Amino acid sequence: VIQWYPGHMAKAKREVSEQLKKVDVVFELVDARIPYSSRNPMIDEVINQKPRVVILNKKDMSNLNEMSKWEQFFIDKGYYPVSVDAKHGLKKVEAAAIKATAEKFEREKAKGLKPRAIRAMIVGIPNVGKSTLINKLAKRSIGNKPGVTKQQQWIKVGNALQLLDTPGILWPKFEDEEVGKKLSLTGAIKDSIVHLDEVAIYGLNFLIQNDLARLKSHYNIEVPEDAEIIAWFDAIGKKRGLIRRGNEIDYEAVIELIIYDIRNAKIGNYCFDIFKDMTEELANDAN
């Protein structure tokens, strides 16, 4: 868990910008379940046209077809998108780094410089899998004594890649309520200010609209199509015995169950950033 406050934000921005001076290429790590909503809102200012691999992590928990639309979006921006499962295991990362830096190193070769390992770092919001990926790529878990301060080191990855063993951590998008719901549904933010009941309502409605049969079969429920959302809570709660004071619904328990099941991909593997539904937001952001 990370506590943002204005001071910490300024520090993070300054420190990451500084690490970026040290590298040839940046890996912007996003959640494949929300490849656009899991980005830091100032990421393009921080990265500042550094060659970029966008890594859509947790691909195992997302929808490939939707992911491919986001990959096209990143391609159109001049980035090199790849998807990975950092947990279950990623030789494609070194390959993407070589392509993203191809133009730079060709210009170096033309000016008569020797070849050298590519330097890279990973940047992204919290909980998207940065430390998981670094440890996997290092093939080992990355001061051990109290009060001893660890120094940032380079990790040799494959043949051509040197990877900074420390990620740059930036803050998530804060300003938009729908984005807040998306981040809570994926578990990027397990924190307050976004009411959990509204997160569960958002998640249920998403599933009703996009995977209704699977939602029903998962909880073994059948619900009238003209019922309001409360009926879904009541049905799940009834079927799972989440009741209190006789046969009233324990809504807190049902809410927590729905959220847990969506967060942990217990119902299905979804991408909650629906590209075709985000056309206006994208246009607003683009210029």
Ligand SMILES: Nc1nc2c(ncn2[C@@H]2O[C@H](COP(=O)(O)OP(=O)(O)OP(=O)(O)O)[C@@H](OP(=O)(O)OP(=O)(O)O)[C@H]2O)c(=O)[nH]1
């Ligand atoms: N299915 C799947 N899970 C992934 C993947 N990458 C990471 N994870 C998991 O997502 C969680 C967050 O990973 P981190 O590496 O710690 O993310 P960071 O970006 O480094 O966060 P940070 O900056 O420190 O705040 C971890 O779960 P937990 O910490 O809860 O432990 P468990 O998986 O056992 O349940 C990872 O195990 C992936 O590609 N697929």
